[PDB]
Design a protein around this ligand. Structure first.
Ligand SMILES: Nc1nc2c(ncn2[C@@H]2O[C@H](COP(=O)(O)OP(=O)(O)OP(=O)(O)O)[C@@H](O)[C@H]2O)c(=O)[nH]1
Ligand SMILES: [Mg+2]
Lengths: 166, 97
């Protein structure tokens, strides 16, 4: 059983905890409680092999930014989340990518760009804007909804695969 | 200066760890209730949601590790401040202890 160390990062309120909780526990949390740092664990089967997922759910609140360095050293792959109705979160993504790149001293860190809340009408960030960003980083882009489960397994398993195929 | 951060370990099978911001006046029972709220959708927690059924254990490295069960009404911040000692708090059912 291979263990995979996944880390979920991005700005406040984009849906990091909701995505993680949907994946681990199969329900949607509608209340908002800001995270400091939570660790989760699940055994899953991906392409016919049993895997252990260690998932670190991190803080969007800028108050906790000094915790980043440690979790970026230890993490094997990063889910970089923004919300498609939150233009600022899409701008903030770039700062997470650069820190991870700096911390790990590598241009080749396993990562997936996620545009979350795709169930909501009247998006303010265009899919193509995120596609262009992902292309420049050399990483997959996937849209998700923690509320409807759209793309959620795909986003996390794609990240496991990026680590596995590295 | 009114709050402090505590990491609680072995919380549930699906949620091994959580960090919470607690009032420094918090008892072990107060911190337990905050932790049960954080892990409230874990199946083991839905099954046993009453904080009075739990304890915090502190494990501290010497100057080998020692362990000690906190009293229900003991101040967690006082215990942490006394560590000699790299340390951790562990959530356990009283029946396990
Ligand atoms: N409609 C909709 N709401 C969502 C979705 N994902 C998260 N939410 C809601 O958005 C709010 C914030 O979600 P969280 O997952 O707590 O956000 P977070 O990124 O973990 O926030 P921090 O821990 O503070 O950084 C909550 O009220 C969630 O119910 C989604 O895909 N669709
Ligand atoms: Mg969160």
């Amino acid at each position: 059983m291979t263990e995979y160390k996944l880390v979920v990062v991005g700005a406040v309120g984009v849906g990091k905890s909701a995505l993680t909780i949907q994946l681990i526990q199969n329900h949607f949390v509608d209340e908002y409680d800001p995270t400091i740092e939570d660790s989760y664990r699940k055994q899953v089967v991906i392409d016919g092999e049993t895997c252990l997922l260690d998932i670190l759910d991190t803080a969007g609140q800028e108050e906790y930014s000094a915790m980043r360095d440690q979790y970026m050293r230890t993490g094997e792959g990063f889910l970089c989340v923004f919300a498609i109705n939150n233009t600022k979160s899409f701008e903030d993504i770039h700062q997470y990518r650069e820190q991870i790149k700096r911390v790990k001293d590598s241009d080749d860190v396993p990562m997936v760009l996620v545009g979350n809340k795709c169930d909501l009408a009247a998006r303010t960030v265009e899919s193509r804007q995120a596609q262009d960003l992902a292309r420049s980083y050399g990483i997959p882009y996937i849209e998700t909804s923690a509320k409807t489960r759209q793309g959620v397994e795909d986003a996390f398993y794609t990240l496991v695969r990026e680590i596995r195929q590295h | 200066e009114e709050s402090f951060f505590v990491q609680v370990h072995d919380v549930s099978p699906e949620q091994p760890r959580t960090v919470i911001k607690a009032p420094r006046v918090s008892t072990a029972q107060d911190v337990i209730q905050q932790t049960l709220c954080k892990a409230k959708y874990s199946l083991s927690i839905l099954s046993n949601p009453n904080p009075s059924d739990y304890v915090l254990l502190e494990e501290v490295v010497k100057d080998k590790s020692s362990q000690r069960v906190l009293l229900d009404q003991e101040c967690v911040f006082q215990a942490q401040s006394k560590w000699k000692g790299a340390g951790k708090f562990i959530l356990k059912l009283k029946e396990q202890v």
